[PDB]
């Protein structure tokens, strides 16, 4: 079967800067709900701390992937194990502020 | 002059190069709507002087993880050629599929 994903991409603090549509079928959020907010928002608590933590390493990992599951909260107020791959970005010609790509998978735990 | 990051779009594909997922940036820069994307293999897309070098980025992105494509030129969807360069990764899971960030160079 097709596994639901869809990507992101976030500035490192966090904050959704773009949301792929294939967010509704994963999740239940139109992009525009998730547009603009933390995805550490949509984290349950025993995981806050790790998401965050993640941020701040994906970004001293030179590009390479970091991979991190956690429970998110879909429009139905359930728990989804979400697989989230994320990697930085920056673009070589400029000096601009990396920015943080993701594909976010909903997965089983088990 | 557009912006860098204006120039900048993302795209998804399957392990056979075929596309699933564009950013929807890519008409404003090279003409294509994402949905007549999906199921056509990137190869397609590229002029053949530039095939053969796409065919080893591609190999190097397989066996290495990662990879940056180095300059290509894309059919344009109302003829000619824009030039690209894109970073590639895969993404393995428990490969799924690959993430190509795409900069229009010209
Ligand atoms: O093989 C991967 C898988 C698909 C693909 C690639 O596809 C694109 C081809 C285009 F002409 C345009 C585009 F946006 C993406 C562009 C570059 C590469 C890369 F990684 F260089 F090999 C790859």
Redesign the pocket.
């Known amino acids: 079967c097709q596994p639901t994903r869809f990507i992101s991409r976030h500035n490192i603090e966090g904050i959704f800067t773009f949301v792929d549509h294939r967010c509704v079928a994963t999740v239940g959020y139109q992009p525009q709900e998730l547009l603009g907010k933390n995805i550490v928002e949509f984290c349950h608590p025993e995981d806050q701390q790790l998401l965050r933590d993640s941020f701040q390493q994906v970004v001293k990992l030179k590009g390479q992937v970091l991979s991190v599951m956690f429970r998110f909260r879909s429009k139905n107020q359930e728990w989804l194990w979400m697989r989230t791959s994320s990697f930085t970005f920056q673009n070589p010609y400029s000096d601009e502020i990396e920015y943080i790509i993701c594909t976010n998978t909903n997965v089983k735990n088990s | 002059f557009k912006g860098l990051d204006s120039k900048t779009?993302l795209?998804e594909?399957s392990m056979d190069?075929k596309?699933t997922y564009?950013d929807d940036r890519?008409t404003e820069l090279?003409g294509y709507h994402p949905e007549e994307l999906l199921g056509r293999?990137?190869?397609e897309?590229?002029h053949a002087l530039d095939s053969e070098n796409?065919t080893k980025?591609?190999q190097?992105?397989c066996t290495k993880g990662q990879?940056?494509?180095?300059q290509?030129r894309?059919?344009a969807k109302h003829g000619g050629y824009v030039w690209?360069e894109?970073?590639?990764t895969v993404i393995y899971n428990p490969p799924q599929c690959?993430m190509?960030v795409?900069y229009v160079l010209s």
């Not at chain 2, 990879?67 to 180095?70: I, M």
């Open positions: 779009f795209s594909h190069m596309f564009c890519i090279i293999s990137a190869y897309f590229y796409m980025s591609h190097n992105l990879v940056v494509s180095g290509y894309m059919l690209l894109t970073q590639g690959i190509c795409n």
